[PDB]
Write a protein that holds these residues in place. Structure first.
Motif, PDB file in Angstrom:
ATOM      1  N   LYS E  61      36.622  39.560  42.526  1.00  0.00           N
ATOM      2  CA  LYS E  61      37.762  39.474  41.621  1.00  0.00           C
ATOM      3  C   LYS E  61      37.370  40.466  40.144  1.00  0.00           C
ATOM      4  O   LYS E  61      36.438  41.091  40.318  1.00  0.00           O
ATOM      5  N   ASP E  62      37.880  40.294  39.299  1.00  0.00           N
ATOM      6  CA  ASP E  62      37.669  41.059  37.933  1.00  0.00           C
ATOM      7  C   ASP E  62      38.374  40.297  36.869  1.00  0.00           C
ATOM      8  O   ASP E  62      39.504  40.125  36.857  1.00  0.00           O
ATOM      9  N   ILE E  63      37.553  39.812  35.812  1.00  0.00           N
ATOM     10  CA  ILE E  63      38.090  39.297  34.622  1.00  0.00           C
ATOM     11  C   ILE E  63      37.892  39.841  33.430  1.00  0.00           C
ATOM     12  O   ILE E  63      36.693  40.159  33.190  1.00  0.00           O
TER      13      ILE E  63
HETATM   14 MG   LIG Z   1      35.918  40.972  36.067  1.00  0.00          MG
END
Ligand SMILES: [Mg+2]
Lengths: 107, 257, 54, 60, 129
Positions: E61-63
């Motif tokens: 993922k990537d936040i």
């Molecule tokens: Mg991220």
């Protein structure tokens, strides 16, 4: 080996055998259990109340009377509930709901 | 792979080419000039510390390490096993408690193990026992747990082996009851608890003594012995591969607590 | 009716359930606050589920 | 004679062996004696000049 | 008081390890928790995926930026634009809009705006390699 001053050989002084670790009502072969996520779910257990040899005849009649709504068209009593879905919380208050129904039908 | 040959289509990649990646650092603007700066930056919890913390070990991740081979089931599952392969890490500091089992989703979990955690659910006890596990709960005191968890360094610390002290009074009744499947309770009271749980789990409790690793399962760890295979008060001479143990009588007595 | 369905209609007789709508179930928060133990057990099912993994 | 210095670690099947000639300084006009290989992780990774400039900075 | 001892087998099991090895064989596939070995031989697709050091399918993922959820496959190799087209094609039924994706050609990665994570792991698993 080494034994503590407060070791289990004295901390449980009477029981020196290994088998007392785990040595030892509702039947396992008769009933059928079901769990399926439907998020939402509904977990159920069904068994043929007519074939219920584990229930007394007055108890079987009381079960067929009170849980007539739980008695299916095929004569199978089923019970479904709602908390969470896996091994220990989902199957055996379904079993224990059956057992408590049997206990309430006893008296 | 056209990359290497496309690079071969140039001269030798000398020191004159190692460019910072475009987007390395935003431009170091001296706060001045006709555009950026004309004025340059001015214009014209009571017991949170006494709260215990216990590392929750995801037992699904324990199944992962079982499947991924981080912790094999051929020997006992101890905090030595729980740390040694880096599946879940402990933090001795922050006034912590230790390793304790987690509580979600034991579907599709087929292995035999002998878990030794500080705490677990009754559902977790039934989870272990469903395939026939072993569940025990002693304490791990602060200096004791810190010595235990990262066993590499204290094996070369130089002091002799400490022994684990008993839990405090608040933690004492927790270990004193076999309903938690612990370490400091009656070894016969555990059987009725196992039967009652198997009834409550709807579980067919197999005669695990009949199993092949029953003797391997028969290892229930001694209190005040952090090392599962070693002697209290010992010294791991890691250079000469030796074990230095005392023989003095009062030293043996204070060691045999 | 079932006899006419089996013999005359030559088809399986359908059965209807007469089922009511289910409960809405309240909103799940981070902590149960002052409520009893029934707050954390609403929106799944049932009776024997368990912990991480055997 | 010949010599085949393969890599000790098992390089994965998702690339072939990374092979080249094997040399020596013994022959003043006799090179190209033997040939060997290395894993892709040894000499055949991505080009990645940016990593090299990172190495340059951490050096200098 | 002192005595030399040779029972360091108990010392040996006390030695924690560093160099993580490949997993032991669980007979059925997927594993109990559903881990998998990569299939052999690898497919003849020019998109190529390596796995993790701890051996899983490389999806993450990537936040960022408060509401910015995105995802990426990290160790891509080969003609990555084909993998981008394939990811858009799989995503085409998934959300309808064209995929907002960017590769990292020097870094050898692919990233898609939005978290389509578990299904993307499934797509890579069904690819097998
Ligand atoms: Mg991220």
């Amino acid at each position: 080996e080494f034994k503590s001053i407060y070791s289990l050989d004295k901390l449980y002084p009477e029981s020196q055998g290994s088998d007392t670790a785990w040595r030892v009502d509702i039947p396992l072969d008769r009933l059928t259990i079901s769990y399926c996520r439907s998020v939402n779910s509904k977990a159920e257990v069904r068994f043929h109340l007519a074939t219920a040899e584990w229930i007394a005849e007055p108890v079987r009649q009381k079960i067929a009377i009170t849980h007539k709504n739980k008695i299916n068209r095929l004569g199978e009593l089923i019970l479904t509930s709602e908390s969470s879905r896996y091994q220990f919380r989902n199957l055996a208050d379904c079993l224990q709901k059956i057992r408590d129904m049997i206990t309430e039908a006893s008296q | 792979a056209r990359a290497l040959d496309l690079l071969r289509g140039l001269p030798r990649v000398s020191l004159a080419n190692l460019k910072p990646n475009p987007g390395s650092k935003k431009p170091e603007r001296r706060p001045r000039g006709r555009r950026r700066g004309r004025k340059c930056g001015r214009g014209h919890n009571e017991g949170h510390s006494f709260r215990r913390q216990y590392k929750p070990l995801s037992l699904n991740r324990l199944q992962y390490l079982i499947d991924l081979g981080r912790v094999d089931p051929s020997q006992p599952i101890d905090l030595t096993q729980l740390v040694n392969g880096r599946g879940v890490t402990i933090q001795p500091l922050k006034r912590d408690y230790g390793v304790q089992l987690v509580e979600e989703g034991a579907d599709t979990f087929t292995a035999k193990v002998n878990i030794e955690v500080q705490l677990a659910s009754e559902l977790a006890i039934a989870a272990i026992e469903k395939n026939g596990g072993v569940v025990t709960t002693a304490f791990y005191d602060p200096r004791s747990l810190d010595i235990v968890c990262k066993p590499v360094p204290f094996f070369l610390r130089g002091q002799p082996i400490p022994k684990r002290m008993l839990p405090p009074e608040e933690l004492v009744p927790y270990y004193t009851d076999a309903k938690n499947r612990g370490y400091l309770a009656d070894p016969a009271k555990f059987p009725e608890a196992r039967l009652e749980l198997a009834r409550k789990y709807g579980y067919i409790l197999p005669d695990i003594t009949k199993d092949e690793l029953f003797k391997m399962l028969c290892t229930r760890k001694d209190p005040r012995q952090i090392f599962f295979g070693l002697a209290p008060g010992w010294v791991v001479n890691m250079a000469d591969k030796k074990i230095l143990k005392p023989t003095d009588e009062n030293l043996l007595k204070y060691y045999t607590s | 009716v079932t006899y006419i369905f089996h013999q005359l209609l030559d088809m399986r007789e359908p059965v209807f359930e007469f089922v009511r709508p289910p409960p809405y179930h309240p909103k799940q928060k981070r902590f149960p606050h002052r409520q009893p133990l029934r707050y954390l057990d609403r929106y799944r099912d049932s009776h024997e589920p368990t912990y991480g993994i055997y | 004679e010949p010599v085949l210095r393969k890599v000790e670690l098992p390089v994965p099947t998702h690339r072939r062996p990374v092979q080249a000639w094997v040399e020596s300084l013994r022959g003043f006009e006799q090179e190209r004696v033997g040939l060997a290989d290395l894993h892709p992780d040894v000499f055949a990774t991505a080009p990645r000049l940016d990593i090299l400039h990172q190495v340059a900075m951490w050096q200098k | 008081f002192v005595e030399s001892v040779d029972e360091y087998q108990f010392v040996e099991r006390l030695l924690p390890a560093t160099r993580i090895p490949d997993p032991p064989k669980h007979e059925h596939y997927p594993t109990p928790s559903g881990w998998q070995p990569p299939r052999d031989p690898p497919p003849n697709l020019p998109y190529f995926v390596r796995r993790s050091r701890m051996h899983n399918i490389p999806v993450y993922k990537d936040i960022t930026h408060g509401n910015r959820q995105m995802t990426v496959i990290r160790k891509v190799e080969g003609d990555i634009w084909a993998l981008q087209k394939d990811v858009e094609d799989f995503l085409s039924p998934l959300l309808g809009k064209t995929p907002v994706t960017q590769v990292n050609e020097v870094t050898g990665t692919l990233r898609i705006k939005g978290y389509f994570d578990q299904e993307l792991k499934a797509w890579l698993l069904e690819k097998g390699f």
